[PDB]
From Swiss-Prot, chains A, J:
Protein name (Swiss-Prot/TrEMBL): Proteasome subunit beta type-1
InterPro entries linked to this entry: Ntn_hydrolases_N, Pept_T1A_subB, Proteasome_bsu_CS, Proteasome_sua/b, Proteasome_suB-type
One GO CC annotation: proteasome complex
GO MF annotations, alphabetized: endopeptidase activity; threonine-type endopeptidase activity
More info: The side chain of Thr-1 acts as a nucleophile, and the N-terminal amino group acts as a proton acceptor.
Species, as recorded: Saccharomyces cerevisiae (strain ATCC 204508 / S288c)
Reactions accelerated catalytically: Cleavage of peptide bonds with very broad specificity
UniProtKB/Swiss-Prot annotation, chain D:
Positions spanned in the full protein: 76 to 287 of 287
Encoding gene, per UniProt annotation: PRE2
Protein name according to UniProt: Proteasome subunit beta type-5
Alphabetical GO biological process terms: proteasomal ubiquitin-independent protein catabolic process; proteasome core complex assembly; proteasome-mediated ubiquitin-dependent protein catabolic process
Organism: Saccharomyces cerevisiae (strain ATCC 204508 / S288c) (Baker's yeast)
Protein's job: The proteasome degrades poly-ubiquitinated proteins in the cytoplasm and in the nucleus. It is essential for the regulated turnover of proteins and for the removal of misfolded proteins. The proteasome is a multicatalytic proteinase complex that is characterized by its ability to cleave peptides with Arg, Phe, Tyr, Leu, and Glu adjacent to the leaving group at neutral or slightly basic pH. It has an ATP-dependent proteolytic activity. This unit is responsible of the chymotrypsin-like activity of the proteasome and is one of the principal target of the proteasome inhibitor bortezomib. This subunit is necessary for chymotryptic activity and degradation of ubiquitinated proteins.
Domain of life per record: Eukaryota
Swiss-Prot record, chain E:
UniProt key word Cytoplasm: yes
Cited InterPro entries: Ntn_hydrolases_N, Proteasome_beta4, Proteasome_bsu_CS, Proteasome_sua/b, Proteasome_suB-type
A biological process from GO: proteasome-mediated ubiquitin-dependent protein catabolic process
Gene name of the encoded protein: PRE4
Source organism phylogeny: Eukaryota, Fungi, Dikarya, Ascomycota, Saccharomycotina
Protein family membership: Belongs to the peptidase T1B family.
Domain of life: Eukaryota
SUBUNIT field: The 26S proteasome consists of a 20S proteasome core and two 19S regulatory subunits. The 20S proteasome core is composed of 28 subunits that are arranged in four stacked rings, resulting in a barrel-shaped structure. The two end rings are each formed by seven alpha subunits, and the two central rings are each formed by seven beta subunits. The catalytic chamber with the active sites is on the inside of the barrel. Interacts with CIC1.
Organism from which the protein derives: Saccharomyces cerevisiae (strain ATCC 204508 / S288c)
More details: Present with 16900 molecules/cell in log phase SD medium.
Identification of the protein by name: Proteasome subunit beta type-7
Curated annotation (Swiss-Prot), chain G:
Record's miscellaneous remark: The side chain of Thr-1 acts as a nucleophile, and the N-terminal amino group acts as a proton acceptor. Present with 11400 molecules/cell in log phase SD medium.
Organism field: Saccharomyces cerevisiae (strain ATCC 204508 / S288c)
Gene for this chain: PUP1
UniProt name for this protein: Proteasome subunit beta type-2
Family: Belongs to the peptidase T1B family.
Biological role: The proteasome degrades poly-ubiquitinated proteins in the cytoplasm and in the nucleus. It is essential for the regulated turnover of proteins and for the removal of misfolded proteins. The proteasome is a multicatalytic proteinase complex that is characterized by its ability to cleave peptides with Arg, Phe, Tyr, Leu, and Glu adjacent to the leaving group at neutral or slightly basic pH. It has an ATP-dependent proteolytic activity.
Active-site residues, as the UniProt record annotates them: T1 (nucleophile)
Catalytic activity: Cleavage of peptide bonds with very broad specificity
Class of this enzyme: hydrolase
Length: 196, 204, 49, 212, 229, 222, 226, 195, 195, 196
């Protein structure tokens, strides 16, 4: 597993790697981890496949019901649904969830929520087992409000080091772009990112 | 259980002015069953007196171990062994096993004959010199003793001042213990004549 | 050490005699050249020479 | 620790010690192992001090509430089997319990019951519970005759506890004697076990092994 | 079932004449991995009490909300005590204590060490301690986490005993906290450069200097170290 | 993994007299080898000439101070200002202890006060439940140091008249309020040097029919 | 138990406490933790008391053998490397934490050696359980090159921080100051706190106030003509 | 463990050993002895662990008799006792544990006094006027203390010992089918078939 | 202990129980009932786990008496065994296990035919000519299948039990100190004093 | 504890820090873990503090005797030694050594020896417990072939990312430069690179 999100000038781009193991055997290597639980508030699943999935539904249940009574919830708000549920099932279940969203007011925001349940605002977040390898590359080379194309090649170069060194991650690199414009999918194949 | 606490045994010892004193109880149990109300656990190799505590068997084994070595020194160097040399020897013997160790707590009490001076020492399980020139005690009601003795003791005690102090200190401690008591035997060690007195006290 | 009781004079003289015996018996060693007179008291026969 | 009771002609002599230990350290040497269940029932304390003491207070609470309702004093067999149903509950919720409820009523006579921590309830004429119940038995059963007189019987309560006290590590402290009559128990005070020693040493000729 | 997952260490504190100085390290650790930086843990609760909480980030965050909700709860009606005597450090303290007491009953305690320090309306310094054991004691100098056998010795020089508080100004007190932080940074693996210093003065309020570094670092001797042979 | 019982040390000591009673304790609080505070009362007055101290695990020992003083309140209310006696108080403490025994208190509790005759009265509780009247009783981690010395001086245990050699037993002497101040001081002098978890301070509370007086003595700083 | 070892320009100064504990009870308020490998290479030890004293004796004998066999004064390393080797053999079933310090012709040294077989070097090191409390005062006050008089006041006041804050440390403060090309001075009892107060009365008892059962005499004098 | 009792009579030691032998859950034999005469005037009885007992018991008869024939004189019970102690002492340190509890009783005709000794499995020698090991010991130690006198004739020692047998039978949950009796005296080592 | 024995003969069921009760280190009572009537022609003798046995006795006794009073009709031994098997079976599934082995012997007065039921701790009843329980019970089976004939009268069945009792004394390593014999005849449930 | 070695055109430069914890307690913060076993074959120690010092004396011994009879051993030669002690005591010794050294002919070379003990020649090696974090930073920005000046700045910055993320790494950075020219220690205090 290797997921990350990193802010930019007009929003955020969310990035992941789609290999999903049980033991030595990969169950399926095309398995998406990028999840829509609200339509401008996406999330990135990691830790156990079961555990995160169950949480992503119950969090969907509570943002659907938010949007019908009180208008669309902010990224800040969706993270706090994740927090308090991770709280209850800290020892019972495990999750790594990085919550990333577009707000039309404060632009894109990235919050990170470990397994204990805490929130921490950050301009960039990494999680999984891919992330204890790429830590140093991400922090030397980062500057806030970088151009869109520079974000795209940074998340790419970051995730190409994650797939290179951690073997738990792999597959295609996928990304979701949250912008004012909308939600745009990217996908980069293995033959593309090994060169880049 | 713990190896020391399977018969009990206490040794107390204190220094005076021109005299030391050592004192034990006589109990040997095998856990809850009291087996004998007499069994001296102090023994004397020349003019040194050796107190031995801890585990039941190791009072016996370790005593005759010192029987053999004291002999080699006395035969060779043609004199009785001085307090200080015997303290060193006990330290050396206890350490000889550290893997499969002894389980005892000796108390060395004597008065040097080369200079006329009290000398006492104490020991632990694995064995190290524990200096004092005040008091040392050992055993399993050693905890209770450490206090008792401190309250009572006064520097420079006279020969038969020293007798009332150590007799009371021991009496009270042993009847606040299960695994020591049933009678007590107090030595008063002078520079020329050591007196053996059994003490009338609670059996129950 | 083992019997906790003072050694007879008989035992001790024979133990030495066997040491000396070992050197003539085997090994190609020379015997120790000593002649002992032992004085002892023991319970059984009293004074012994 | 040792609590023994034996029925005789006159009622029951209960005789108990007063040393209650914690660790190898001796806590207190003045503990009363008699629990007044009412003036006409005496409860022993053996096994865990906390467990045994408490529930027999409350057994005295139900004793007064059998007593009002029937307008008739609680029977010895009714008390015992109350206490028994209670401790079966906490049978493997980790609690202890060794009491002899000892009583004498006018229409049932002297009757001992020995209620356990498993909810076993055994009747009988002699019981002994404790960490010195092996030491106690021997002497108590040698010196037994069912037909006995009060003076002699009083002396037996001492003599068995004494023996128990001498060899047992946790027995000693003080002894107490009570003599249960039908009219109630009458308390016979406190004898130190070590001052008792020297008396019976002279009188019998016992304890040859103790030097002096 | 409670085990610390993400950890904080070290909050130190002492009294002076007109108030107290409470200051803490800033660092969200994950053992060896320092995964979170700049983690605030001097939580201002009122403005005449700072609660500095340490231990699990998760456990602190979740009792951080109850602290804010307490100030709301007091502020309900009462026009001469809705912000005028609603709060003293002492009140806030008791509440923390028995909530943790009741969570240790469950045996999923809130995993934290908590210092509550402020100055009351009597002008009395206040400084007490609660933890996941739930021991409650007052102390004139105090510390938590890894500083609770490191920083405690240093500060006891100033504060030999209970009569040395009125001698000790707010200028000496700055100096002690600074020195303590240096030393924590050297000998503790959980510590960091960034610490926050609050002075709760009774005559100048919650004075919160934010984002202090440690100063006058000694690393001159370190080139003079050689082989073992 | 969680284990909710530590030790916080300290030592307590109860002495009954003939018109007085003394409940003292130290004011050292520790957790392992670090000194938390030199100053910290454990011997609280609780009203009506009862002084309590629950020593051992500190948190527990504050828990039963909480509930005990709560009962002082509800007794006086629904009995319309009835003075609660030593006998009565004892039995309440025992109910709170015992009712938690599947999460028990892990302290050694002692109360002291006067009784209705105008003599000292000291009862002492074991951890789980039950209790028994005493006349001398220490508790805490330095219990086994103070106790055999005080039976040697209060009850004169195994002592005899002099020059008779075990024929005559030494008679039990009366106890002054002045004399029992000295014993506490001497004892706690011995405690300090030979045991590492008593220190800083000694606080004697002497309780009489006249009132509660506090008296503070220093001990050694270590 | 606070035992500090602090280098300064002209030599090394090593200080100790003298309170030696065994669990919650103070066994002895007066022993010394300072041993003598060699006359100008003192060492102190902490941890299991038996395993310090015996390891210091054992290796003490062998560096003195050697020192005759080279007909030269011993060096700090000589002791230090023998230590290291020995503790490693059992794989740290021996629990020693010794500060080894000393001077010799080729300068001042100061090492510390842990129970497995690890070794570090600094200019201020501390072992013991109180070690933490020492270390705090040491890191602020210390500076590069001290004089002798300054170095003994830093040393002593570092053990005192120890005394006050660490239960298991107390008693007297010994010092042994080792300075290159002058003899090593042992300053036992430099500064002594923790004086015991006078008893409120004495507890002297008159004769016969404990019972006697019977009397005999034990004869410890040698066997002679009757 | 089973029955194994001593009582030091004025002039003799009266030892008694269990008949019953249970290895597994079925009594297999019930007339077996657990005693082997070391020397003409020292008898040793043993109980402890199964199979350890039979071998180690043969071992001591062998060695003490080895020395007897060397010196054409027999060791004192004090001296044999010390040998048995010595060996078992080495055995709790050694790789394989032995576990043998022994009462060694003998009549020394050179001290002119009967001697009785109790050596437990750990290796502690103790001189006693009555003794016992194990389960039996717990009921009898107190029973013998009661009635004893310093000097008691031989047939008084038998009567007492049969009070101790009789008692045991009621109280022990184990069944032992009566003892075998042996007297060790100054006039030799004999058995009494009366139980 | 753990010995309850049954031999059914052609006019009678003979149930026998251990006298001894041994709890803790000693035998407390060597004479004690260990069986209670359920009905006037239905007897349950029981053994097993301490402290379940007292309780499971009086609980059954309360229920069967409740039926027999309520409806004026004594239950069939067929019915009674089932009822007891229901509780035993239920307690294995429940929190508190009941470990008790129960032999229920009755004289059916509807068939006029003796019947003996063997119910193990788990709860499977099975009617038998004879049955036993415990490790002790093992020893009795092989004499029972030798000497039994099913034409037998009161006296012949008695003489077979007596061998079984004697056997137990030689071969068993733990006492039980005799037995109480109780017989479910056609004129009630009679206690006979023969050993 | 972070240890690395990086080869360059005219040699190899070795890099270690000086923070060495046991627990949370920093034992000495000026610790030296770059060790001489020969005179141009230097090593870096990481792993269990006892087991590296132990092994490393034993190699010092073998190598110096090799000098005295046979002539100087090679980097190759020394690397084999360290393998042959790890492999035969792989059951109980936790030691990962980097053996970097200057042969005359072949310039600087790096060999790294796992815990299980095995030769691997590498263009650069990292091992420790805080050097897991910089696998991505070294890999991407590693230029095969560097100059003396370029090399020291590359390794300085690699050690800074490792320090930032590991609380077992900090203090001053120690470097040894092994070139034909000789042996030069360099040292960087923290103020000098936490600015960059």
């Amino acid at each position: 597993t290797s997921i990350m999100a990193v802010t930019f000038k007009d929003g955020v781009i969310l990035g992941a790697d789609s290999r999903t193991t049980t033991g030595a055997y990969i169950a399926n290597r095309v398995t998406d981890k990028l999840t829509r639980v609200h339509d401008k508030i996406w999330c990135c699943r990691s830790g156990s496949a079961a555990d995160t999935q169950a949480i992503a539904d119950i969090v969907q249940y509570h943002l659907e019901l938010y949007t019908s009574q009180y208008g669309t919830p902010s990224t800040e708000t969706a993270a706090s649904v994740f927090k308090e549920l991770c709280y209850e099932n800290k020892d019972n279940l495990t999750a790594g969830i990085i919550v990333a969203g577009y707000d039309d007011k404060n632009k894109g925001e990235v919050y990170t929520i470990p397994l204990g349940g805490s929130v921490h605002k950050l301009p960039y977040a990494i999680a999984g087992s891919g992330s204890t390898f790429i830590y140093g590359y991400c922090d030397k080379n980062f500057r806030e409000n970088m151009s869109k194309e520079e974000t795209v090649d940074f998340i790419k170069h970051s995730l190409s080091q994650a797939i290179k060194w951690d073997g738990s991650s792999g597959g295609v690199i996928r990304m979701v772009v949250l912008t004012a414009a909308g939600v745009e999918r990217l996908i980069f194949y293995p033959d593309e990112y090994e060169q880049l | 259980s713990d190896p020391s606490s399977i018969n009990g045994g206490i040794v107390v010892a204190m220094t005076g002015k021109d005299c030391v004193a050592i004192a034990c109880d006589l109990r040997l149990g095998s856990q809850s069953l009291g087996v004998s109300n007499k069994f001296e656990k102090i023994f004397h190799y020349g003019h040194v007196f050796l107190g031995i505590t801890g585990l039941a068997t190791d009072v016996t084994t370790l005593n005759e171990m010192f029987r053999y070595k004291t002999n080699l020194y006395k035969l060779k160097e043609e004199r009785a062994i001085e307090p200080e040399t015997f303290t060193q020897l006990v330290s050396s013997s206890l350490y000889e096993r550290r893997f499969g160790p002894y389980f005892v707590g000796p108390v060395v009490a004597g008065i040097n004959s080369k200079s006329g001076k009290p000398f006492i020492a104490g020991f632990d399980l694995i064995g190290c010199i524990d200096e004092a020139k005040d008091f040392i005690v050992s055993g399993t009601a050693s905890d209770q003793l450490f206090g008792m003795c401190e309250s009572l003791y006064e520097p420079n005690l006279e020969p038969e001042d020293l007798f009332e102090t150590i007799s009371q200190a021991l009496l009270n401690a042993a009847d606040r213990d299960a695994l020591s008591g049933w009678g007590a035997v107090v030595y008063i060690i002078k520079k020329d004549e050591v007196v053996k007195r059994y003490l009338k006290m609670r059996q129950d | 050490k083992t019997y906790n009781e003072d050694i007879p004079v008989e035992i001790l003289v024979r133990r030495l005699s066997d040491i000396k015996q070992g050197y003539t018996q085997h090994g190609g060693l020379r015997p120790f050249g000593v002649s002992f007179i032992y004085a002892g008291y023991d319970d059984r026969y009293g004074y012994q020479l | 620790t040792t609590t023994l009771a034996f029925r005789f002609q006159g009622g029951i002599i209960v005789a108990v010690d007063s040393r209650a230990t914690a660790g190898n350290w001796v806590a207190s040497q003045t503990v009363k192992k008699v629990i007044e269940i009412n003036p006409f029932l005496l409860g022993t304390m053996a096994g865990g001090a906390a467990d045994c003491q408490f529930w027999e207070t409350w057994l005295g609470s139900q004793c007064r509430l059998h007593e009002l309702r029937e307008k008739e004093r609680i029977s010895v067999a009714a008390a015992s089997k109350i206490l028994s149903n209670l401790v079966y509950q906490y049978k493997g919720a980790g609690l202890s319990m060794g009491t002899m409820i000892c009583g004498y009523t006018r229409k049932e006579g002297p009757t001992i019951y020995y209620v356990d921590s498993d909810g076993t309830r055994l009747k009988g004429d002699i019981f002994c519970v404790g960490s010195g119940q092996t030491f106690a038995y021997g002497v108590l059963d040698s010196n037994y005759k069912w037909d006995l007189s009060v003076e002699d019987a009083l002396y037996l309560g001492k003599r068995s506890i004494l023996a128990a006290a001498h060899r047992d590590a946790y027995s000693g402290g003080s002894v107490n004697l009570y003599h249960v009559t039908e009219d109630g128990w009458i308390y016979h005070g406190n004898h130190d076990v070590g001052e008792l020693f020297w008396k019976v040493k002279e009188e019998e000729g016992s304890f040859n092994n103790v030097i002096g | 079932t409670q085990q610390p997952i993400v950890t904080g260490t070290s909050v130190i504190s002492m009294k002076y004449d007109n108030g107290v100085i409470i200051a803490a390290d800033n660092l969200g650790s994950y053992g060896s991995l320092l995964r979170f930086n700049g983690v605030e843990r001097l939580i201002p609760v009122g403005d005449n009490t700072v609660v500095g909480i340490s231990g699990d980030i998760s456990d602190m965050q979740h009792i951080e909300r109850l602290l804010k909700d307490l100030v709301t709860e007091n502020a309900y009606d009462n026009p001469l005590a809705d912000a005028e005597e609603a709060l003293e450090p002492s009140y806030i303290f008791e509440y923390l204590a028995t909530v943790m007491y009741q969570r240790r009953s469950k045996m999923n305690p809130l995993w934290n060490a908590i210092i509550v320090a402020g100055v009351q309306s009597n002008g009395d310094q206040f400084l007490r301690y609660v933890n996941l054991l739930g021991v409650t004691y007052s102390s004139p100098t105090l510390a938590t986490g890894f500083g609770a056998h490191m920083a405690n010795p240093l500060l006891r020089k100033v504060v030999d005993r209970e009569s040395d508080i009125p001698k000790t100004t707010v200028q000496v007190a700055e100096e002690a906290i600074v020195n303590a932080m240096r030393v924590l940074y050297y000998r503790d693996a959980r510590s960091s450069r960034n610490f926050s210093l609050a002075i709760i003065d009774k005559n100048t309020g919650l004075t919160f200097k934010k984002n202090l570094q440690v100063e006058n670092m000694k690393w001159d001797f370190a080139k003079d170290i050689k082989g073992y042979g | 993994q969680f284990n909710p019982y530590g030790d916080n040390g300290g030592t307590i000591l109860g002495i009954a007299g003939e018109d007085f009673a003394v409940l003292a304790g130290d004011t050292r609080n520790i957790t392992d080898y670090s000194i938390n505070s030199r100053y910290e009362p454990k011997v609280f007055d609780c009203g009506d000439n009862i002084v309590m101290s629950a020593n051992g695990f500190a948190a527990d020992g504050d828990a039963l101070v909480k509930r005990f003083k709560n009962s002082v309140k509800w007794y006086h209310f629904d009995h319309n200002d009835k003075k609660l006696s030593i006998n009565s108080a004892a039995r309440n403490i025992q109910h709170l202890l015992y009712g938690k025994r599947f999460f028990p208190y892990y302290v050694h509790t002692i109360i002291a006060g006067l009784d209705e005759d105008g003599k000292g009265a000291v009862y002492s509780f074991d951890p789980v439940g039950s209790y028994e009247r005493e006349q001398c009783r220490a508790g805490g981690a330095a219990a086994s140091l103070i106790m055999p010395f005080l039976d040697n001086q209060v009850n004169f245990k195994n002592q005899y008249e002099p020059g008779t050699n075990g024929k005559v037993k030494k008679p039990l002497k009366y106890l002054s309020v002045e004399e029992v101040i000295k014993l506490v001081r001497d004892s706690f002098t011995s405690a300090t040097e030979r045991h590492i978890q008593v220190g800083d301070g000694l606080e004697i509370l002497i309780v009489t029919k006249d009132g509660v007086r506090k008296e503070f003595y220093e001990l050694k700083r270590d | 138990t606070t035992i500090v070892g602090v280098k300064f320009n002209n030599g090394v100064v090593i200080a100790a406490d003298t309170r030696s504990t065994q669990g919650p009870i103070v066994a002895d308020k007066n022993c010394a933790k300072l041993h003598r490998i060699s006359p100008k290479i003192w060492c102190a030890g902490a941890g299991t008391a038996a395993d310090t004293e015996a390891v210091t004796q054992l290796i003490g004998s062998n560096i003195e053998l050697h020192s005759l066999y080279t007909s030269r004064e011993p060096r700090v390393v000589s002791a230090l490397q023998m230590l290291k080797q020995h503790l490693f053999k059992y794989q740290g079933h021996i629990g020693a934490y010794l500060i080894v310090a000393g001077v010799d012709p080729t300068g001042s040294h100061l090492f510390s050696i842990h129970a497995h077989g690890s070794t570090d070097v600094g200019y201020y090191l501390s072992l013991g359980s109180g070690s933490l409390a020492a270390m705090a005062v040491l890191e602020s006050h210390w500076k590069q090159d001290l004089t002798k008089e300054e170095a003994i006041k830093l040393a002593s006041d570092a053990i005192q921080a120890g005394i006050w804050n660490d239960l298991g440390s107390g008693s007297n403060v010994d010092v042994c100051v080792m300075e290159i090309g002058k003899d090593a001075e042992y300053l036992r009892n430099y500064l002594t706190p923790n004086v015991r107060e006078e008893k409120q009365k004495s507890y002297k008892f008159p004769r016969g106030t404990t019972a006697v059962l019977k009397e005999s005499i034990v004869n410890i004098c040698d066997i002679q003509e009757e | 463990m089973d029955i194994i009792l001593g009582i030091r009579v004025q002039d003799s030691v009266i030892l008694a050993s269990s008949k019953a032998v249970t290895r597994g859950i079925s009594v297999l034999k019930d007339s077996d002895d657990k005693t082997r005469q070391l020397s003409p005037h020292t008898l040793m009885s043993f109980a402890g662990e199964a199979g350890d007992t039979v071998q180690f018991a043969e071992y001591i008869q062998a060695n003490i008799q080895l020395y007897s024939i060397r010196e054409d004189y027999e060791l004192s019970p004090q001296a044999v006792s010390s040998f048995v102690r010595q060996e078992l002492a080495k055995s709790i340190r050694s790789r394989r544990p032995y576990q043998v509890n022994v009462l060694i009783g003998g009549y020394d005709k050179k001290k002119n006094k009967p001697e009785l000794y109790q050596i437990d499995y750990l290796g502690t020698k103790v001189e006693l006027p009555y003794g016992a090991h194990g389960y039996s010991g717990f009921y009898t130690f107190s029973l013998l203390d009661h009635h004893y006198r310093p000097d008691m004739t031989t047939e008084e020692g038998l009567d007492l010992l049969k009070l101790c047998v009789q008692e045991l039978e009621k109280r022990m949950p184990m069944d032992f089918k009566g003892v075998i009796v042996k007297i060790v005296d100054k006039d030799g080592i004999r058995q009494v078939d009366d139980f």
